[PDB]
């Protein structure tokens, strides 16, 4: 009875009642220009599709964008924020690309464009601020990253691993993070909230191989997020 | 019981068997040099006292060090990391003082020393890394910062950076921090049955509802499990 009385408590949980839930934008970068020096990302496509599928399961509108340049990425993001989220309860943004640690004020890390030009996670998040995007005002804004005064609110960012470090793959079973995220979400998204799920993910992904991969979270959420399912 | 299971699941929750739970250092900068320009964080003595009884009640060997310089803070910290938390289950660091925002590579944030010189959160978190302190390896390492004004793989680190101005009594800048007061109350009511992350969400919501043209505590986590504090 408690679980149903919490999930329904609007002061402790973000009520995800609309159908569909919101937009989910997956940006998939695999092929990098020669000058950058970034190795082709084998398997990123199997990951992409797992996620596309998963968030669809979770009732989102998923659009994928493959191989985009720094300038095109920021253009998709501005486009997304430019939308009318009025009738939506949430918004998701996934970025499957190469990355690194970047100097920041609020949100760490940067992600590479197919052109090798970086984009700060921080710049990505803010594109979704209340001024530029009042439709998502007050609503949870999630950010999933598989890499290497408009006060920011309800911003959630998960990192395949603390920026600067290594994310371990396996072109066939998929990268640990995306695979584990898909699995755990499959298992529990119906009875468990976003932060609990990411705990299982982090813990799970933490027991593989020599080098330990360590999924991150940088949150400014006010309530627990329970994904809609079926 | 669902919660009962949750609490006792070693895979889903950092089990706290020992007693005490660990060390807790609260640095409390109240009086800053005049050149700093930074005002006297009065009322902070009330905040600090509330927090030391809170973490005390949470089973920690709390130690309070007030008015430290950027260097003495780094020293006070360096010390805590030289200890052998080996038999302990978790470590806590609370920092009350003025803070300044600055671009950084690893972690965001910085707190002001009594001298007026900044100490980046990056450096604070790093001081407790696996190497410099294996004693706390794999164990939960908590950092609560309340600062108005704003290959050692990182693991089991948790940083709560609040910058919520606002007193317990708005008419009196010396009544204490509304954030602290609010967090403390939240702990008094749910610690006995809600994990760290859940407690702080309650707090986050209370803050957002309290003020609007104000930010909200930013959390950064590398925890692998839930943390149910010891409460007797």
Residue numbers in the entry:
A (entry chain A): 140 to 287, 335 to 416
B (entry chain B): 140 to 289, 335 to 416
Authors' description from the paper:
For example, the autoactivation of caspase-9 is mediated by the assembly of a heptameric complex involving Apaf-1 and cytochrome c, dubbed the apoptosome.
To solve this problem, we mutated the catalytic residue Cys287 to Ser and were able to crystallize this catalytically inactive form of the dimeric caspase-9. First, the dimeric caspase-9 exists as an asymmetric homodimer in an identical manner to the WT caspase-9. Just like the WT caspase-9, there are two molecules of the dimeric caspase-9 in each asymmetric unit, and the crystal packing interaction is identical. The only significant structural difference occurs at the solvent-exposed surface loops L2, L4, L2′, and L4′.
